[PDB]
Design an enzyme around this catalytic site. Structure first.
Site, PDB file in Angstrom:
ATOM      1  N   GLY A  80      17.274  71.563   2.922  1.00 59.54           N
ATOM      2  CA  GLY A  80      18.258  72.604   2.694  1.00 59.54           C
ATOM      3  C   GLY A  80      17.707  73.800   1.947  1.00 59.54           C
ATOM      4  O   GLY A  80      18.122  74.936   2.197  1.00 59.54           O
TER       5      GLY A  80
ATOM      6  N   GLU B 122      32.712  92.637   7.695  1.00 58.69           N
ATOM      7  CA  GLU B 122      33.734  92.984   6.715  1.00 58.69           C
ATOM      8  C   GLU B 122      33.548  92.217   5.411  1.00 58.69           C
ATOM      9  O   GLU B 122      33.970  92.694   4.350  1.00 58.69           O
ATOM     10  CB  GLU B 122      35.119  92.726   7.306  1.00 58.69           C
ATOM     11  CG  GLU B 122      36.185  93.702   6.857  1.00 58.69           C
ATOM     12  CD  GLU B 122      37.404  93.675   7.760  1.00 58.69           C
ATOM     13  OE1 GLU B 122      37.298  93.105   8.871  1.00 58.69           O
ATOM     14  OE2 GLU B 122      38.460  94.216   7.358  1.00 58.69           O
TER      15      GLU B 122
HETATM   16  N1  LIG Z   1      28.891  68.489  -1.693  1.00 55.83           N
HETATM   17  C1  LIG Z   1      27.918  67.771  -1.134  1.00 55.83           C
HETATM   18  N2  LIG Z   1      26.654  67.781  -1.689  1.00 55.83           N
HETATM   19  C2  LIG Z   1      25.657  67.059  -1.132  1.00 55.83           C
HETATM   20  C3  LIG Z   1      25.890  66.296   0.003  1.00 55.83           C
HETATM   21  N3  LIG Z   1      24.730  65.684   0.335  1.00 55.83           N
HETATM   22  C4  LIG Z   1      23.777  66.043  -0.555  1.00 55.83           C
HETATM   23  N4  LIG Z   1      24.337  66.883  -1.474  1.00 55.83           N
HETATM   24  C5  LIG Z   1      23.652  67.523  -2.606  1.00 55.83           C
HETATM   25  O1  LIG Z   1      22.427  68.026  -2.126  1.00 55.83           O
HETATM   26  C6  LIG Z   1      21.379  67.799  -3.042  1.00 55.83           C
HETATM   27  C7  LIG Z   1      20.261  67.052  -2.324  1.00 55.83           C
HETATM   28  O2  LIG Z   1      19.911  67.759  -1.157  1.00 55.83           O
HETATM   29  P1  LIG Z   1      20.047  67.137   0.324  1.00 55.83           P
HETATM   30  O3  LIG Z   1      20.930  67.974   1.221  1.00 55.83           O
HETATM   31  O4  LIG Z   1      20.549  65.714   0.267  1.00 55.83           O
HETATM   32  O5  LIG Z   1      18.513  67.149   0.815  1.00 55.83           O
HETATM   33  P2  LIG Z   1      18.090  67.544   2.316  1.00 55.83           P
HETATM   34  O6  LIG Z   1      18.627  68.888   2.714  1.00 55.83           O
HETATM   35  O7  LIG Z   1      18.539  66.469   3.282  1.00 55.83           O
HETATM   36  O8  LIG Z   1      16.481  67.636   2.270  1.00 55.83           O
HETATM   37  P3  LIG Z   1      15.509  66.346   2.183  1.00 55.83           P
HETATM   38  O9  LIG Z   1      14.684  66.447   0.920  1.00 55.83           O
HETATM   39  O10 LIG Z   1      14.594  66.374   3.382  1.00 55.83           O
HETATM   40  O11 LIG Z   1      16.333  65.076   2.175  1.00 55.83           O
HETATM   41  C8  LIG Z   1      21.954  66.991  -4.186  1.00 55.83           C
HETATM   42  O12 LIG Z   1      22.137  67.854  -5.281  1.00 55.83           O
HETATM   43  C9  LIG Z   1      23.304  66.524  -3.694  1.00 55.83           C
HETATM   44  O13 LIG Z   1      24.236  66.574  -4.743  1.00 55.83           O
HETATM   45  C10 LIG Z   1      27.158  66.277   0.570  1.00 55.83           C
HETATM   46  O14 LIG Z   1      27.379  65.603   1.578  1.00 55.83           O
HETATM   47  N5  LIG Z   1      28.172  67.022  -0.006  1.00 55.83           N
END
Ligand SMILES: Nc1nc2c(ncn2[C@@H]2O[C@H](COP(=O)(O)OP(=O)(O)OP(=O)(O)O)[C@@H](O)[C@H]2O)c(=O)[nH]1
Ligand SMILES: Nc1ncnc2c1ncn2[C@@H]1O[C@H](COP(=O)(O)OP(=O)(O)CP(=O)(O)O)[C@@H](O)[C@H]1O
Ligand SMILES: Nc1nc2c(ncn2[C@@H]2O[C@H](COP(=O)(O)OP(=O)(O)O)[C@@H](O)[C@H]2O)c(=O)[nH]1
Ligand SMILES: O=C(NCCN1CCCC1=O)Nc1ccccc1
Ligand SMILES: [Ca+2]
Ligand SMILES: [Ca+2]
Ligand SMILES: [Ca+2]
Ligand SMILES: [Mg+2]
Ligand SMILES: [Mg+2]
Ligand SMILES: [Mg+2]
Lengths: 54, 438, 425, 352
Positions: free
Chosen positions: B146, B254
């Site tokens: 992410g 917008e």
């Molecule tokens: N609100 C919310 N936060 C999430 C969720 N899944 C992960 N997080 C948050 O995202 C962060 C971890 O990032 P991830 O999205 O799990 O990691 P990734 O994008 O899969 O990247 P990788 O390292 O390859 O696993 C943590 O701080 C979590 O609290 C979700 O389903 N909902």
């Protein structure tokens, strides 16, 4: 406390309210950054294999 | 009608994307098999909901979405979930091993090898758009995918779709639901490379979504399901103007015109009310003034901070349900007299108001109760700079010892990129203080 | 499908490795014949992390058994769960290693290593996505110490970007087979410093003291010591063998536990540890207080003598997760002087619904503490006590080694202690 | 075991509060950079409020109200009074004041001269005082030319307010004085007034025909102990406490401190704090705030109380440190973090 630009349709309406008036990297340059990091990994792994050959 | 393509990156982007499209369907009357009875134009039409959905000859309404995760476990849920029929396999892209919470791994090591594939799939959606507005990108700050892959995807989209707008929905890291110690690193790394590429970013602090679940929904230990279903209500409120008839925030352009006077300061604070536990015996339905006043309570902001000690640059009231303009203006009058709302001198002191008569749709069986009127306020406050301060402070603590840096250098990233990204944040915090403080 | 390849080398390595597979095979509902007979879907959810699936729904541990003498591995094969291991995965010689690092690393072991890598390569070639390797071995003998590290050196050469993980039994004079154990351990520690990402340090003195003082075992045996190792190995691998999002794979675990490449030596812990007052229910606060007690830790290092860089706690069993968070934050907020303040939120916690066999709920402790330098300090002193007189060196020079190589390993581990010392302040 | 940090080594008040906390055996002091704390005794300037209330499981409490500078700054107070409807420009208990920016930099220069020229024509007393927060740097003059030119020589903002030409003089001595009140506002916004006050009296006879010698005009403890030759003559350290001042008001004026001065002081305290409550309250905030204030008052020969300024980080009289600091631990800190009277405060009820 003025209202302006009132737009009304079937699914709602919008408007503005005023309280007081006022007073990139190219595709080439991105490929270089990526290949530069890939090369730094290649060099580091080479020094590791060099270390292991010794 | 202009189309909007949504991109979900990493586990957070994909699971949040799942909850939103689940909601989008319930709001537009689209069944899990893609069928939409109300849509009388079979396999075509330039309606407002067609900005988020294309149509097939069989009458299936397909989300204009792409899901990307460097590990297939989270996206396989979509492939075999309730709405497995909505999407086709082209829309779901999965690698075989993730970025190990390493920004450098997602951006460089792994990102370099899969970027051309995602863009190809994205281009496939673009080719169905007669007038593509831009992209809505869902992802987290802490994750390696992410944070790391998103920044690379944004850089390439700006090259391929130069004139197209790009909004973000970013998950700010909160220790209560995080087991990755290096998330401050990734967050600051991805904010540095994406800042010049994102036109508008709605940050959501898990810490804030977390407490709203324990406080309002009486959830002792909230799960990602609880968090995402609440997050998709806010996202739904923000994107409704694009999916419904209306005249406010009708296209992605917008959003920047109405919320971002200065480009770098493109992180509007979101505040939502009311959030009511469905398990309640039965709640007293709140009024327009009461839900409006709640928009100035820290307890329902997506990011915990004090707007009283910042300056507003923009303010949007998005209402859903039984609400007439007469009530909005009356509530606003009584709030200026009782609230601390300081605007910047170079900006008019006012509010933009959008009203959609259809009240909020709640997922059957979810945690949220049906209400007759809700509101989401999008305000650009310098107060949100507190979140950058918190995050930069944690960065300084670890980086002062170079702790964990070797994991990033080991993936081909130069150490200098840390300091480069950190100085950018020091300038971002500086820009905020120049605008709000006297 | 993130597969891990298991390797157990030498006497200690194979006896601990055996009990380890015995313990987890019971938690995944796998019987000694490889047939599944559990009652929950969680038992098979992550079953392919340590087991391959054969015809007829058989599950065969992805483990390679290595030794320079047949003895110990004949016991494994004839042991209870011996029939479960892949017959081709037994790789052994006949000469032995005479508790000699040089024989395991240069001569006897060098003759057999290639054939062990033929099996390692075979198991890896059939992995959808190989996470990395875990090795169980002692550092005080000849095979698990000398050949074990030789294997790590050659596995990294062929799989340089995989995670290398070891459970390493460190020797103690109080629980000793031979006087040359400090020699063998000092030579391996340098190997581990260079070629592993995670090393769980397990001091045989901690295991003995626990069996004696805590478990009230008048005359502990290696079997009693290995019972603890089994339970601890099962705990630390709970993140890997069941559904979860915290420290799910080896690399993510390392990313959160190793702030510096060379300081990757962890202190494990386990609670409860009760002698036979064994039926009493244990509360979450109790479980947490014990889990952090040095007497529940298996590196024989007082954590109150150093500082924690990172901590990974795993709670197993149906319990109050809300109550787990409060007690964890309580220990951090009640002893924040022992955690470094330049790593925010360096204490993470994970939960697991399936408890170990015979416990309503347990807790496993993985600590990356600067106090671990005491372990390397003991080994260094014992080393220098003999090496200053060149005592017992002829065993090693006779295998081709030179005194210089001993001086360097001595200097390497002293550097390691000095590195742990700067981060303690 | 509660935990607190110390980020202001120069605070004499909170050096005693910390000494008392550790004396209870239930408060453990951490390093000034350890975030896992229940209580922060923060710095004066640039206190990072934004980093408070984000620790899971820790109820965090700080000893400053974010935004209270609007009240504890010379110009801020003036702007606050003139703009706040609750206080109004026609405020009767605050001396007529003006905010004057030096000409080398809104500004109320002309507004001041207008009122100044009116008093000059109306034969009324026209003696003003120029002061600033960047002072030890004060000028008392009856000519507006000298008050304005004095500010231009400085590079910071000043305030010109009417000089109380008819202050209440104590006897024997014929000397000017001031009153210091300590107020504490807890996390719930209860306004507590310390029963004990102090009078920092001037050891020199008040002189109305010589504003140049600022020894009999300024009642600052440091000025009397440095330039006043009668320091410590009438009372120890130029400090007359409430018990003595009340006996004086009864033997000389046939009145009491409660009726003639204390009612006004309590009224001014409420109006100031209540005025800003909606801006600095931490009722629904992720962290909690409490602060100790030092109000400075004036009393004229008509027994009328005027507000001089508000000190956000005030000091306490040497004799009252023990009682006051202990009280802070009872109503402000233990009220949030309880341990395992005849309150020394006077609650000022109000509508939140
Ligand atoms: N609100 C919310 N936060 C999430 C969720 N899944 C992960 N997080 C948050 O995202 C962060 C971890 O990032 P991830 O999205 O799990 O990691 P990734 O994008 O899969 O990247 P990788 O390292 O390859 O696993 C943590 O701080 C979590 O609290 C979700 O389903 N909902
Ligand atoms: N308008 C006015 N009329 C009469 N006296 C005044 C006055 N303004 C200030 N003073 C005198 O000045 C003294 C207080 O000065 P001021 O408070 O402005 O400076 P300061 O803030 O550095 C001292 P402190 O903060 O310790 O109370 C009082 O003793 C008072 O006698
Ligand atoms: N915990 C434990 N330690 C052992 C066991 N067997 C041997 N050791 C220790 O391991 C060291 C000897 O190494 P060993 O494995 O016997 O030599 P190898 O067979 O050549 O690898 C000594 O310090 C022993 O105390 C065992 O079953 N359990
Ligand atoms: O085999 C023997 N020594 C091999 C070398 N060594 C010595 C220390 C350990 C080791 O491996 N000795 C032997 C003893 C009895 C009968 C026959 C031979
Ligand atoms: Ca249609
Ligand atoms: Ca662009
Ligand atoms: Ca031979
Ligand atoms: Mg992931
Ligand atoms: Mg042996
Ligand atoms: Mg002052």
């Amino acid at each position: 406390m003025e209202v302006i630009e009132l737009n009304k349709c079937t699914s709602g309406q919008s408007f503005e309210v005023i309280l007081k008036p006022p007073s990139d990297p190219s595709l080439e340059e991105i490929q270089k950054k990526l290949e530069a990091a890939e090369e730094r990994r290649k060099y580091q792994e080479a020094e590791l294999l060099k270390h292991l050959a010794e | 009608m202009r189309e909007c393509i949504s991109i979900h990156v990493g586990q957070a982007g994909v699971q949040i994307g799942n909850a939103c499209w689940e909601l989008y369907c319930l709001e537009h009357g689209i069944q899990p098999d893609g069928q939409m009875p109300s849509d009388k134009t079979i396999g075509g039409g330039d309606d407002s909901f067609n900005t988020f959905f294309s149509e097939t000859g069989a009458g299936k309404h397909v989300p204009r979405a792409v899901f990307v995760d460097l590990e297939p476990t989270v996206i396989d849920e979509v492939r075999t979930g309730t709405y497995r029929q909505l999407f086709h396999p082209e829309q779901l892209i999965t690698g075989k091993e993730d970025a190990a919470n390493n920004y450098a791994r997602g951006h460089y090591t792994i990102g370099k090898e899969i970027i051309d594939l995602v863009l190809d799939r994205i281009r496939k959606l673009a080719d169905q758009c007669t007038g593509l507005q831009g992209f809505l990108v869902f992802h987290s700050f802490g994750g390696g995918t992410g944070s790391g892959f998103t920044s690379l995807l944004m850089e390439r989209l700006s090259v391929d779709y130069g004139k197209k707008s790009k909004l973000e929905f970013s998950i700010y890291p909160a220790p209560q639901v995080s087991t990755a110690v290096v998330e401050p690193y990734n967050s600051i790394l991805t904010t540095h490379t994406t800042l010049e590429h994102s036109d508008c970013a709605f940050m959501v602090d898990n810490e804030a979504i977390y407490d709203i679940c324990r406080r309002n929904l009486d959830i002792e230990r909230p799960t990602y399901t609880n968090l995402n279903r609440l997050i998709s209500q806010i996202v739904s409120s923000i994107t409704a103007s694009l999916r419904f008839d209306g005249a406010l925030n009708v296209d992605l352009t917008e959003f920047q015109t109405n919320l971002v006077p200065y480009p770098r300061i493109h992180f509007p604070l979101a505040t939502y009310a009311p959030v009511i536990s469905a398990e309640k015996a039965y709640h007293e339905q709140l009024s327009v003034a009461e839900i409006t006043n709640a928009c100035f309570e820290p307890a329902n902001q997506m990011v915990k901070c004090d707007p009283r000690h910042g300056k507003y640059m923009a303010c949007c009231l998005l209402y859903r349900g039984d609400v007439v303009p007469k009530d909005v203006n009356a509530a606003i009058a009584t709030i200026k007299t009782k609230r601390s709302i300081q605007f910047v001198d170079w900006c008019p002191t006012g509010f933009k108001v959008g009203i959609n008569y259809q009240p909020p749709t709640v997922v059957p069986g979810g945690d949220l109760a049906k209400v007759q009127r809700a509101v989401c306020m999008l305000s650009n406050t310098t107060a949100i700079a507190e979140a950058w301060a918190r995050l930069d402070h944690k960065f300084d603590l670890m980086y002062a010892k170079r702790a964990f840096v070797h994991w990033y250098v080991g993936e081909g990233m130069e150490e200098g990129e840390f300091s480069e990204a950190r100085e950018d944040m020091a300038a971002l915090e500086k820009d905020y203080e120049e605008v709000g403080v006297d | 499908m993130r597969e891990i390849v298991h390797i157990q080398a030498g006497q200690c390595g194979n006896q601990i490795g055996a009990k380890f597979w015995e313990v987890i095979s019971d938690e995944h509902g796998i019987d000694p014949t490889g047939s599944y007979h559990g009652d929950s879907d969680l038992q098979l959810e992550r079953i392919n992390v340590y087991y391959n699936e054969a015809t007829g729904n058989k599950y065969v541990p992805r483990a390679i058994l290595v030794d320079l003498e047949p003895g110990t591995m004949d016991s494994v094969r004839s042991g209870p769960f011996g029939q479960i291991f892949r017959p081709d995965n037994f790789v052994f010689g006949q000469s032995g290693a005479g508790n000699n690092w040089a024989k395991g690393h240069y001569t006897e072991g060098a003759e057999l290593v290639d054939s062990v890598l033929d099996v390692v390569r075979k198991e890896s070639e059939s992995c959808d996505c190989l996470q990395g390797f875990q090795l169980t071995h002692s550092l005080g003998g000849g095979t698990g110490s000398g050949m074990g590290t030789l294997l790590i050196s050659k596995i990294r050469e062929e799989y340089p970007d995989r995670i290398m993980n070891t459970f390493s039994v460190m020797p103690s004079p109080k629980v000793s087979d031979t006087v040359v154990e400090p020699y063998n351990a000092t030579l391996s520690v340098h190997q581990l410093v260079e070629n592993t990402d995670e090393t769980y340090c397990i001091d045989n003195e901690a295991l003995y003291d626990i069996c004696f003082r805590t478990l009230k075992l008048t005359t502990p045996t290696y079997g009693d010591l290995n019972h603890l190792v089994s339970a601890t190995m099962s705990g630390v691998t709970t993140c890997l063998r069941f559904p979860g999002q915290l420290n799910a794979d080896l690399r993510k675990l390392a990313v959160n536990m190793v702030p510096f490449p060379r300081l990757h030596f962890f202190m494990p812990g386990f609670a409860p540890l009760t002698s036979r007052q064994q039926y009493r229910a244990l509360t979450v606060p109790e479980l947490t207080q014990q889990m952090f007690d040095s007497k529940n830790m298996m590196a024989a290092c007082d954590p109150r003598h150093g500082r924690y860089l990172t901590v990974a706690a795993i709670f197993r069993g149906r319990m109050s997760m809300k109550e787990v968070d409060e007690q964890m934050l309580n220990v951090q907020n009640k002893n924040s002087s022992y955690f470094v303040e330049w790593i925010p939120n360096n204490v993470k916690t994970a939960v697991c619904d399936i408890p170990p066999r015979g416990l309503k709920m347990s807790a496993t402790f993985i600590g990356n503490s600067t106090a671990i330098q005491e372990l390397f300090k003991r080994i260094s002193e014992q080393f220098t006590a003999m090496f200053r007189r060149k005592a017992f060196l002829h065993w090693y020079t006779g295998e081709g080694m030179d005194e210089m190589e001993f001086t360097e390993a001595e200097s390497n581990m002293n550097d390691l202690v000095s590195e742990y010392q700067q981060y303690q302040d | 075991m509660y935990t607190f940090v110390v980020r202001d080594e120069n605070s004499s008040v909170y050096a005693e509060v910390s000494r008392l906390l550790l004396a209870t055996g239930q408060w453990k002091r951490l390093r000034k950079d350890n975030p896992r704390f229940n209580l922060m005794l923060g710095e004066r300037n640039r206190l990072p409020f934004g980093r408070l209330g984000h620790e899971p499981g820790l109820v965090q409490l700080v000893n400053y109200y974010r935004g209270a500078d609007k009240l504890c700054r010379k110009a801020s107070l003036v702007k606050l009074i003139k703009t706040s409807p609750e206080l109004s420009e026609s405020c009767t208990w605050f001396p007529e004041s003006y905010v004057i920016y030096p000409t080398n930099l809104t500004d109320e220069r002309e507004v001041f001269l207008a009122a100044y020229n009116r008093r000059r024509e109306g034969r009324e007393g026209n003696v003003w005082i120029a002061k600033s927060s960047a002072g030890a740097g004060i000028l008392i003059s009856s000519e507006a030319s000298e008050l304005l030119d004095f500010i231009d020589e400085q590079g910071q903002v000043h305030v010109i307010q009417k000089y109380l030409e008819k202050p209440l003089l104590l006897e024997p001595g014929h000397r000017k004085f001031d009153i210091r009140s300590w107020v504490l506002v807890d996390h719930l916004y209860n306004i507590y007034l310390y029963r004990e006050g102090v009078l920092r009296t001037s050891s020199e006879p008040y002189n109305s025909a010589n504003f140049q010698d600022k020894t009999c005009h300024l009642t600052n403890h440091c000025i009397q102990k440095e330039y006043s030759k009668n320091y410590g003559r009438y009372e120890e350290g130029n400090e007359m406490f409430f018990e003595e001042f009340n006996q004086y008001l009864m033997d000389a004026l046939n009145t009491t401190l409660e009726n003639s001065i204390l009612l006004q002081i309590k009224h001014i305290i409420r109006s100031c704090l209540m005025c800003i409550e909606p801006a600095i309250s931490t009722k629904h905030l992720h962290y909690q705030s409490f602060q100790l204030f030092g109000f400075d008052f004036m009393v004229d020969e008509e027994l009328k109380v005027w507000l001089i300024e508000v000190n956000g980080a005030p000091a306490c009289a040497q004799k009252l440190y023990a009682e006051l600091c202990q009280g802070i631990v009872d109503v402000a800190i233990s009220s949030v973090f309880p341990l395992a009277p005849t309150s020394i405060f006077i609650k000022l009820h109000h509508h939140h």
